[PDB]
Design a protein around this motif. Structure first.
Motif, mmCIF file in Angstrom:
data_model
loop_
_atom_site.group_PDB
_atom_site.id
_atom_site.type_symbol
_atom_site.label_atom_id
_atom_site.label_comp_id
_atom_site.label_asym_id
_atom_site.label_seq_id
_atom_site.Cartn_x
_atom_site.Cartn_y
_atom_site.Cartn_z
ATOM 1 N N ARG A 110 0.825 -1.210 0.000
ATOM 2 C CA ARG A 110 0.000 0.000 0.000
ATOM 3 C C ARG A 110 0.859 1.260 0.000
ATOM 4 O O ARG A 110 0.475 2.282 -0.570
ATOM 5 N N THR A 111 2.023 1.181 0.641
ATOM 6 C CA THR A 111 2.808 2.373 0.951
ATOM 7 C C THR A 111 4.026 2.609 0.057
ATOM 8 O O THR A 111 4.387 3.753 -0.211
ATOM 9 N N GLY A 112 4.668 1.536 -0.390
ATOM 10 C CA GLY A 112 5.904 1.673 -1.133
ATOM 11 C C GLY A 112 6.979 2.257 -0.237
ATOM 12 O O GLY A 112 8.060 2.636 -0.697
ATOM 13 N N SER A 113 6.671 2.332 1.053
ATOM 14 C CA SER A 113 7.622 2.809 2.048
ATOM 15 C C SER A 113 8.206 1.623 2.809
ATOM 16 O O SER A 113 7.495 0.946 3.546
ATOM 17 N N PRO A 114 9.509 1.366 2.627
ATOM 18 C CA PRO A 114 10.188 0.249 3.289
ATOM 19 C C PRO A 114 10.589 0.625 4.709
ATOM 20 O O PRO A 114 10.750 1.809 5.001
ATOM 21 N N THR A 162 5.366 15.303 -2.551
ATOM 22 C CA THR A 162 6.644 14.625 -2.799
ATOM 23 C C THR A 162 7.441 14.319 -1.534
ATOM 24 O O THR A 162 8.176 13.335 -1.492
ATOM 25 N N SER A 163 7.321 15.167 -0.518
ATOM 26 C CA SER A 163 7.965 14.892 0.758
ATOM 27 C C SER A 163 7.255 13.737 1.456
ATOM 28 O O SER A 163 7.892 12.912 2.105
ATOM 29 N N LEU A 164 5.934 13.683 1.312
ATOM 30 C CA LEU A 164 5.133 12.618 1.913
ATOM 31 C C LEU A 164 5.405 11.280 1.237
ATOM 32 O O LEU A 164 5.293 10.225 1.859
ATOM 33 N N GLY A 165 5.756 11.324 -0.042
ATOM 34 C CA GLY A 165 6.017 10.107 -0.789
ATOM 35 C C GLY A 165 7.437 9.594 -0.636
ATOM 36 O O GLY A 165 7.816 8.603 -1.258
ATOM 37 N N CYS A 166 8.226 10.267 0.195
ATOM 38 C CA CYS A 166 9.625 9.899 0.402
ATOM 39 C C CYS A 166 9.772 8.896 1.550
ATOM 40 O O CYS A 166 10.252 9.239 2.632
ATOM 41 N N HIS A 167 9.349 7.657 1.294
ATOM 42 C CA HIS A 167 9.343 6.580 2.289
ATOM 43 C C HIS A 167 9.006 7.041 3.714
ATOM 44 O O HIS A 167 9.807 6.894 4.634
ATOM 45 N N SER A 168 7.807 7.583 3.891
ATOM 46 C CA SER A 168 7.422 8.161 5.173
ATOM 47 C C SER A 168 6.450 7.289 5.958
ATOM 48 O O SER A 168 6.212 7.536 7.139
ATOM 49 N N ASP A 169 5.888 6.277 5.301
ATOM 50 C CA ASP A 169 4.847 5.441 5.903
ATOM 51 C C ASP A 169 3.506 6.172 5.996
ATOM 52 O O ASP A 169 2.501 5.581 6.389
ATOM 53 N N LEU A 170 3.493 7.451 5.627
ATOM 54 C CA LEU A 170 2.284 8.267 5.730
ATOM 55 C C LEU A 170 1.510 8.345 4.418
ATOM 56 O O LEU A 170 0.460 8.981 4.356
ATOM 57 N N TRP A 171 2.019 7.705 3.372
ATOM 58 C CA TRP A 171 1.437 7.890 2.048
ATOM 59 C C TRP A 171 1.048 6.611 1.312
ATOM 60 O O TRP A 171 1.737 5.594 1.384
ATOM 61 N N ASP A 172 -0.071 6.690 0.601
ATOM 62 C CA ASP A 172 -0.522 5.621 -0.274
ATOM 63 C C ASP A 172 -0.341 6.094 -1.710
ATOM 64 O O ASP A 172 -1.200 6.792 -2.255
ATOM 65 N N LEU A 276 11.397 0.949 -3.926
ATOM 66 C CA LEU A 276 10.482 1.792 -3.165
ATOM 67 C C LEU A 276 9.641 2.647 -4.110
ATOM 68 O O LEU A 276 9.889 2.682 -5.316
ATOM 69 N N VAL A 277 8.641 3.328 -3.568
ATOM 70 C CA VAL A 277 7.779 4.155 -4.394
ATOM 71 C C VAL A 277 7.747 5.600 -3.929
ATOM 72 O O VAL A 277 7.240 5.903 -2.853
ATOM 73 N N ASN A 278 8.300 6.481 -4.753
ATOM 74 C CA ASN A 278 8.213 7.911 -4.530
ATOM 75 C C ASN A 278 7.041 8.479 -5.310
ATOM 76 O O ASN A 278 6.314 7.744 -5.976
ATOM 77 N N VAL A 279 6.867 9.791 -5.226
ATOM 78 C CA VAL A 279 5.752 10.466 -5.867
ATOM 79 C C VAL A 279 6.273 11.731 -6.529
ATOM 80 O O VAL A 279 7.129 12.417 -5.967
ATOM 81 N N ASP A 280 5.779 12.040 -7.725
ATOM 82 C CA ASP A 280 6.196 13.269 -8.395
ATOM 83 C C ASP A 280 5.347 14.459 -7.958
ATOM 84 O O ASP A 280 4.374 14.298 -7.221
ATOM 85 N N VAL A 281 5.723 15.652 -8.407
ATOM 86 C CA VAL A 281 5.024 16.866 -7.997
ATOM 87 C C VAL A 281 3.548 16.825 -8.382
ATOM 88 O O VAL A 281 2.748 17.615 -7.882
ATOM 89 N N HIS A 282 3.196 15.893 -9.263
ATOM 90 C CA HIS A 282 1.813 15.718 -9.699
ATOM 91 C C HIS A 282 1.098 14.640 -8.896
ATOM 92 O O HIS A 282 -0.083 14.381 -9.117
ATOM 93 N N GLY A 283 1.812 14.000 -7.978
ATOM 94 C CA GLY A 283 1.219 12.952 -7.166
ATOM 95 C C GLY A 283 1.264 11.581 -7.820
ATOM 96 O O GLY A 283 0.790 10.599 -7.249
ATOM 97 N N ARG A 284 1.833 11.518 -9.019
ATOM 98 C CA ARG A 284 1.981 10.256 -9.743
ATOM 99 C C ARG A 284 3.128 9.418 -9.183
ATOM 100 O O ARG A 284 4.218 9.933 -8.923
ATOM 101 N N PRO A 285 2.889 8.115 -8.996
ATOM 102 C CA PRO A 285 3.921 7.229 -8.444
ATOM 103 C C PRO A 285 5.228 7.241 -9.239
ATOM 104 O O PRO A 285 5.230 7.241 -10.471
#
Length: 458
Positions: A110-114, A162-172, A276-285
């Protein structure tokens, strides 16, 4: 325009013109702040330094500021002010506190956060903080490090994806929303409203416009994570832009960050193989795969003096490839147990060369092959842009070109200041310095070589 890049080791303030050329730059190492034996990002003090340097550009027609922050940094505001300096993500977290947290995280699918050590996962910090400052956390507005600075100048708290998508466990990532966990714990409700990195947070605070001598009309943008700055930049190149492309950054860590042109199934990615899964400025994985390339190479060459990227050495490095190739002289993964695509690969030489150039050349091949495996884990195709110091590594890049024959491997023409990317948040039409030059495969071969290598690995 002014970019504030408050990274982990270096904080840089930069002044640019409407044509995207840097007029000035002010830097300053980031020293940790002690508070209890607890290492902290020095927010109060950095705020000062950057009100000084901002004062310096008062004679200029500044119409926009855009903030940039390293990841794994979270800030809390109690009653509209900074509750305390944020934790240094390198600060250790108590064993018992971490295990408790570790056993309540969402699935990697769900998270892509390791699971990461210390504060690398923002969730871990939050978890701990809930113990040390229970009340202050419940009254707190939460807000990523980069956005913290946009509130420092603006009074408005906001979050950016993008900060939230940086392996934070806070993002889907797939869902484009907070994770089940962050919602469950009530963490998601504490966050400042999410805004797009290029959105205007607001006008410069009057009290601030004052002591900097900047116009009250100056507009602050949401800003973004350090790493996505480079992605913006890369997308400035005519070959990258909106196309299916992957940026491969190098250094201690080799990191492949793909910009898919199609929807991808990230829930299927192999956590154990360092993806892992990051997110771009558009919210795209942004599907990602890393391995500690630079660290392994350094194990091999021992000292800075034999770094495989030293320019005058390239031809000799290059000329030494032919014999490495045909004698089957090679290296088996891995030299960093627990990291990369081959976490438990039993390291080993095969027909170890006895001279440095052939050993140094072969090191560049091993990193190409492991990068090759990593790029494939995430479905990287079409266009690959190599950046970082190992871009000057002729044996590495050209070996990559050979492995991906129909793929277009690139390297940049001229240096670009690390902070350029943000400009493209204002003027997307703006491009980086230099152009992309396609990399030629290694002169003739590499299949037989990789075939042997691959076979051996198995």
């Amino acid at each position: 325009t002014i970019v504030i890049d408050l990274g982990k080791t270096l904080s840089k303030v930069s002044l640019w013109d409407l044509d995207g050329r840097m007029l000035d730059r002010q830097v300053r190492p980031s020293i940790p702040l002690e508070i209890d034996g607890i290492r902290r990002l020095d927010a109060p003090d950095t705020g000062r330094w950057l009100l000084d340097v901002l004062s310096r550009y008062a004679d200029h027609p500044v119409t926009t500021i855009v903030p940039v922050g390293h990841g794994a940094g979270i800030a809390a505001l109690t009653d509209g002010r900074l509750a305390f300096p944020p934790l240094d993500y390198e600060q250790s977290i108590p064993e018992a506190v971490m295990a408790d947290y570790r056993s309540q995280r969402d699935p990697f699918a769900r998270t892509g956060s390791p699971a990461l050590p210390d504060g690398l996962n923002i969730g871990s910090q939050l978890w701990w903080l809930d113990q040390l400052h229970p009340d202050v956390m419940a009254n707190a507005t939460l807000l990523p490090w980069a956005q913290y600075w946009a509130w420092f100048l603006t009074g408005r708290a906001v979050s950016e994806v993008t900060s939230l998508g940086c392996h934070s466990d806070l993002w889907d990532p797939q869902d484009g929303d907070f994770s089940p966990m962050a919602k469950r714990l009530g963490w998601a409700a504490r966050f400042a409203p999410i805004v797009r990195a290029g959105d205007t947070v607001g006008a410069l605070l009057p009290a601030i416009a004052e002591r900097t001598g900047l116009s009250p009309d100056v507009q602050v943008l949401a800003g973004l994570h350090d790493s996505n700055a480079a992605l913006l930049a890369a997308r400035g190149f005519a070959e990258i832009a909106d196309n299916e492309a992957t940026v491969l950054s190098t250094g201690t860590w080799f990191i492949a960050m793909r910009l898919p042109a199609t929807p991808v199934d990230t829930a299927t990615l192999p956590e154990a193989r360092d993806c892992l899964v990051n997110v771009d400025v558009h919210g795209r994985p942004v599907p990602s795969a890393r391995f500690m390339g630079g660290r392994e190479i350094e194990t091999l060459i021992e000292i800075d003096t034999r770094r495989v990227d030293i320019k005058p050495d390239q031809p000799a490095l290059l000329a030494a490839v032919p014999e490495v190739l045909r004698h089957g002289r090679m290296i088996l993964p891995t030299l960093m147990r627990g990291f990369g695509p081959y976490p438990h690969g039993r390291f080993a030489w095969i027909n170890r060369p006895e001279d440095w150039f052939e050993r140094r050349a072969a090191a560049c091949l091993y990193a190409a092959l492991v990068a090759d495996t990593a790029l494939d884990l995430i479905g990287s195709t079409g266009r690959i842009l190599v950046e970082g110091r190992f871009a000057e590594a002729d044996v590495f890049v050209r070996a990559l070109a050979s492995l991906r024959p129909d793929c277009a491997v690139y390297t940049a023409n001229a240096h670009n200041d690390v902070s350029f990317g943000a400009l493209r948040l204002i003027d997307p039409g703006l491009r980086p310095q230099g152009e992309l030059v396609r990399i030629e495969p290694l002169d003739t071969d590499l299949d037989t070589y990789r075939n042997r290598w691959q076979a051996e690995v198995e």
